């Protein structure tokens, strides 16, 4: 009985092997196979691609801890987004739901409830002790829960407790649950990101990196405020060049969003990957160049 699946792939980024010792198709397959010896829950299929394996676990959490200590072990790899495994029960198609149990200071209770609300979660139990904390229990589709561990930890300032586990399958919620609405900012080249470019770009959305970040072509470097994707230049600037042509301000950069693995997984769409190394997490389009992406969308 498995509930979520994703693809574990060899890291083909221009940066492969620069951060983790273990990068082979062989080494990854060997390591997955080894995991299957003590993980009853886990399923690993070879695919029509020698560099890609479809991995299925009890849920996203289980896949993520596996990715996380492959990281620790020196592995480099790319993963596709966690997809829930729909199942046809009777005639209707249904999706997995989890039970989440939370324990929070009352101070955080409103925010946490709101957030789970927004992720299509259903209040089942609410139980204050009289000492300032409160237990909540929700039932939420797996699809909507992905990403919440990190949200919860941040919004609770690390004081909250969270436990989630597969409950059951039920009729599918409607819509783009867990699905990013915005577009991404994609780097058009390889090099060192500079503040003079980032300064202009941060007007366009929210950046994932800052001055001095080493970047390649196809790497996703931020969130676009509009729904469409933007191929941008973060190696040299144009905004201040334009500013002097009227006014001038001082270059000040908003701190970048730093994303946990779980968040990177929540964020990416079908055409992207999370690049994962022992010391770094990156996001990229599957097709690294703008030329490739254009070709894909055309017929
Ligand atoms: Mg998503
Ligand atoms: Mg989108």
CB under 8 Å to 2, separation ≥6 — which residues?
41, 42, 43, 56, 57, 58, 85
**Resolution reached, in Å?**
2.5
Same domain for 149 and 200?
no
Q: Are 186 and 231 a contacting pair, CB within 8 Å?
A: yes
Q: Which of the 8 DSSP states describes residue 183?
A: -
Which of the ligands is closest to the CA of residue 176?
1
149: left (phi over 0), alpha (psi -120 to 50) or beta: alpha
CATH of the domain at 168: 3.30.70.240
User: Structurally, how many domains does the chain consist of?
Assistant: 3
Question: Using CA atoms, how far apart are residues 103 and 229, in angstroms rounded to an integer?
Answer: 39
Q: Which residues contact 34 (CB under 8 A, 6 or more apart)?
A: none
Report the DSSP pairing between strands 230-232 and 184-187.
parallel
Ligand nearest to the CA of 80: 1
Tokens representing 208 are 């994932």
Provide the residue range defining the domain that includes 61. Answer: 1-85+260-286
Domain termination residue (choose one: 111, 146, 179):
179
Q: What is the CATH number of the domain that holds 52?
A: 3.30.70.870
- Cβ contacts of 276 within 8 Å, gap of 6 or more: 11, 67, 70, 71, 75, 76, 77, 78, 79, 261
Cβ-proximal residues to 105 (8 Å cutoff; 6+ apart), any chain: 132, 133, 134, 156, 159, 160
Distance CA 160, CA 109 (A): 10
Q: Residue 293 is encoded by which pair of tokens? A: 């992406």
**Method of elucidation:** X-ray
* Three-state SS letters, 126-179: EEECCCCEEEEEEEEEHHHHCCHHHHHHHHCCCCCEEEEEEEEEEECCCCCCCC
Whether residue 197 sits in one domain with residue 296: yes
Write out the DSSP string of 213-233.
-EE-TTEEEEEESSSS-EEE-
Residues 219 and 293 in one domain: yes
Do 197 and 134 share a domain, yes or no?
no
Residues 57, 41 contacting (CB under 8 angstroms): yes
Centroid of ligand 2 to alpha carbon of 267 (angstroms)? 10
CA-wise closest residue to 153 among 256, 276, 66, 262: 262
**Using CA atoms, how far apart are residues 46 and 228, in angstroms rounded to an integer?**
34
* Cα(113)–Cα(36) distance, integer angstroms: 37
- Picking from 179, 212, 237, the residue at the C-terminal end of a domain is 179
Of the listed ligands, the closest to the CA of 146 is 1
Ligand having the closest approach to the CA of 184? 2
Same domain assignment for residues 194 and 292: yes
Is residue 39 a contact partner of residue 96, using CB atoms and an 8 Å limit? Answer: no
Spacing, Cα 176 to ligand 2 middle (Å):
10
Tokens of 285: 């389009």
Element (H, E) at 18: none
> How far does residue 44's CA lie from ligand 1's centre (Å)?
22
User: Cα-Cα-Cα-Cα dihedral of 129, 134, 140, 144, to 10°?
Assistant: -160
Are residues 8 and 28 in contact, defined by beta-carbon separation less than 8 angstroms?
yes
Residue by residue, what is the 3-state secondary structure of 28-56? HHHHHHHHCCCCCCCEEEECCCCCEEEEE
Q: Give distance in angstroms: CA of 245 to centre of ligand 1.
A: 41
Contacts 24+ apart (CB under 8 A), 175-178: 177/119, 177/120, 177/141, 177/143, 177/144, 178/119, 178/143, 178/144, 178/146, 178/147, 178/266
Residues 187, 250, single domain; the answer is yes
How many angstroms is it from 281 CA to the middle of ligand 1? 16
Matching residue, tokens 């209040």: 123
Whether 187 and 295 map to the same domain: the answer is yes
**Same-domain pairing of 236 and 143:** no
Ligand 2 centroid distance, CA of 60 (Å):
21
Identify the domain boundary among 179, 195, 221: 179
Q: Which ligand is the nearest neighbour of the Cα of 181?
A: 2
Token pair of 282 as six digits: 């990156």
Q: To 5 degrees, how large is the angle CA 269–CA 271–CA 277?
A: 80
H helix count then E strand count, the chain: 9, 18
Rg (CA), the chain: 21
For residue 265, how far is its CA from the centre of ligand 2 (angstroms)?
14
264 and 280 in a common domain: yes
- Cα 82 to averaged position of ligand 1 atoms, centre (Å): 8
Ligand 1 center to residue 11 CA distance, Å?
Answer: 20
Tokens linked to 235:
């190696």
């Amino acid at each position: 009985g498995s509930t979520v699946s994703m693809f574990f792939c060899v890291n083909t980024s221009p940066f492969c092997g620069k951060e983790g010792k273990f990068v082979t198709s062989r080494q990854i397959l060997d390591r997955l196979n080894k995991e299957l010896v003590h993980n009853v829950a886990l399923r690993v299929e070879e695919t029509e691609d020698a560099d890609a394996f479809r991995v299925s676990g009890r849920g996203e959490l289980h896949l993520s801890v596996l990715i996380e200590n492959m990281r620790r072990e020196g592995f480099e790899l790319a993963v596709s987004r966690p997809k829930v495994i729909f199942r046809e029960i009777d005639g209707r198609k249904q999706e997995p739901y989890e039970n989440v149990t939370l324990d929070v200071e009352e101070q955080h209770q409103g925010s946490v409830m709101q957030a789970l609300g927004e992720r299509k979660g259903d209040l089942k139990n609410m139980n204050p002790d009289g000492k300032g904390r409160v237990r909540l229990d929700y039932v939420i589709p797996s699809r909507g829960l992905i990403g919440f561990r990190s949200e919860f930890m941040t919004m609770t300032s690390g004081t909250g407790l969270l436990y989630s586990t597969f409950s059951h399958y039920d009729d599918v919620r409607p819509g783009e649950v867990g699905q990013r609405q915005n577009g991404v900012l994609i780097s058009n080249g390889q090099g060192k990101a500079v503040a003079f470019a980032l300064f202009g770009l941060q007007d366009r959305g929210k950046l994932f990196l800052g001055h001095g970040a080493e970047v390649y072509e196809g790497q996703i470097i931020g969130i676009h405020s509009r729904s469409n994707d933007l191929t941008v230049n973060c190696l040299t600037g144009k905004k201040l060049t334009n500013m002097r042509a009227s006014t001038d301000e001082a270059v000040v950069l908003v701190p970048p969003i730093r994303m946990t693995l779980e968040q990177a997984l929540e964020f990416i769409d079908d055409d992207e990957l999370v690049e994962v190394t022992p010391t770094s997490i990156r996001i990229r389009k599957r097709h690294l160049t703008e030329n490739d992406r254009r070709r894909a969308n055309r017929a």
